[model samples]
Target: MDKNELVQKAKLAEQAERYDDMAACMKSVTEQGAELSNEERNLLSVAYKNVVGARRSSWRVVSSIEQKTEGAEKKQQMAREYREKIETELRDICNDVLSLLEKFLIPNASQAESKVFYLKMKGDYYRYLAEVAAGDDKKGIVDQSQQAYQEAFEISKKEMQPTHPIRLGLALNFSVFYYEILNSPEKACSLAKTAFDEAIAELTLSEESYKDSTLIMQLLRDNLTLWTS
Candidate 1:
């Protein structure tokens, strides 16, 4: 199928909650679109993986809820099984996207886009891990999420230029990870300060150059101040 046709089919599958079919359609599109340039392939691969990841995450949540409604022994077993399944699927999706990114050798702009994709997925994954950790009384899962966020922060800092809006986004993401996931108000404040400083530096360059920087700076400063208070 053509790209548009394949995308439409994938959308339909997604709307119907046919995650497997959606993933298949997306995979087909990426494979067929591979004949295009690296940039095009990279874009398609990122988009496909995003859809697959979203569906997989939704399935995980549903499965978790289902497992919770069963008897004690059955519930424990089912929850364990489903959690493992989600972990495996999420790791596979991450590996697949990372592999495609490596093969395509995406440029800086594309790398930034891919990083944004990963940040979004990682944020959701961390949030889910937080819920599971709390529910299962598993401190280890919480620690794992914290480590994952730290790694994601390093990747974001390395991949995104200082002046890029994505840098502010990455910093904001780190703030969230600190406040919500790690429950470290001090670290969150520190990261927020970094974002605020970057925003100010970006704005001072030229009003016409980084217009959004002003607004972002204000927001970051406000969030940090609020958190501190």
Candidate 2:
């Protein structure tokens, strides 16, 4: 199929909520090394996000079951196997999308906003990998996540307004990375507080991005409250 046709198909697939098909189409677009429009960037992200998001949820459930299946050796072992299989699939998809982003998408992104968004996505997928990875593998994935988030943080500060929806979204996710992946509630709370304070101080709530920006701000505040309490 033609690249444009694949992207069109991906768009239709997304509207239909057939994310597997959407992902397949977007994967071909990425493999072809086409420069993505902002819309395509979102489609790619949503496709992989939904695909990986479901597996992550299943992994958590299976993992908990495997851990709690005490006094039943065979059952516990089977549960463990099932959990590991999910982890394996999760890692594969994470690596696949991350590779495409790094190789084809990120390098060619034209705008600072797009760059920040793609880099934030890099951090996100790596964070997902960290969730299912173990020991040294987890350590490496966490480091990659931090690096990507930090790069996006710096770029956002230089080229985007603090109240920009993309910047605030990055802050929200970065705070989560610190709190959950790095196990630093203090850092997460402080980061979330600063972002919320800065945005609220300047925001009149009438800007063009008022909806998206405020939505992310609410999430930031929610996390801060949860973390502090």
Candidate 3:
């Protein structure tokens, strides 16, 4: 076991489905006077969601909003009223999450990877706020969410290699947010192509990861095709 390469060890633990080992390994990654690599943070986020306590509340809010907004009986006023009713509860939840980031995650973060999950959490919270707001009143909240997404996106360029899948995935996610919530297709298309091309330019058929990567590239190409058509 390379004492320093806990990220690689976490992968082995994952492949073996040794949750106990992965849990122990996650602790070691943070505690061994070591920094969390982007990959290591990814593993930690996965483990934390399953092993730790929070219910992915922002996710629930997003899901709930989608469900409530369906059908004609579910008119805009009905939707707006339900959202207004939940404002206090939702704000309370968002506040707690912000505190978790401020007190535990943000300060303890070793780098950009460590901060990505919280940033997305922030983005989702703001997105929810925007969803419940009336018309142009929602714009500021959307921008806040987008800013958080952009911060997470920039982390890849600052901390990870250009060809790294972390960068590619973050690029795709932010683009999706833009396309779906912000109604911005051009931003989405431009970023997807830039990320896909730079990543593909670095790959070769001889590499073991390429075959799998083609799947991601296909998805990117598909996004462009779907949106353009």
Highest TM-score model number: 2
Tell me each candidate's TM-score. 0.52, 0.96, 0.58
> 137, model 3: CA deviation in Å?
5.5
**Model 3 regions more than 4 Å off:** 1-95, 134-137, 204-215
Give per-residue CA lDDT, model 3, range 100-219, as digits (tens). Answer: 555555567766655665576556556656655557867877888899878877776677655555556667767777787889899999988888887777764536556556666777
Better of 1 and 2 by lDDT: 2
* Candidate 2 segments exceeding 4 Å error: 204-208
Judged by whole-model lDDT over C-alpha atoms, candidate 3 comes out at: 0.64
Ranking by lDDT: 2, 3, 1
lDDT of each: 0.60, 0.90, 0.64
Q: What TM-score does structure 1 among the candidates reach?
A: 0.52
Deviation in angstroms for 146 in model 3? 1.5
Number of the candidate with higher TM-score, 2 or 3: 2
Return the top candidate by lDDT. Answer: 2
State the TM-score for model 2: 0.96
**Model 3: per-residue Cα lDDT at residue 192:** 88
Which clashing pairs does model 3 show? none
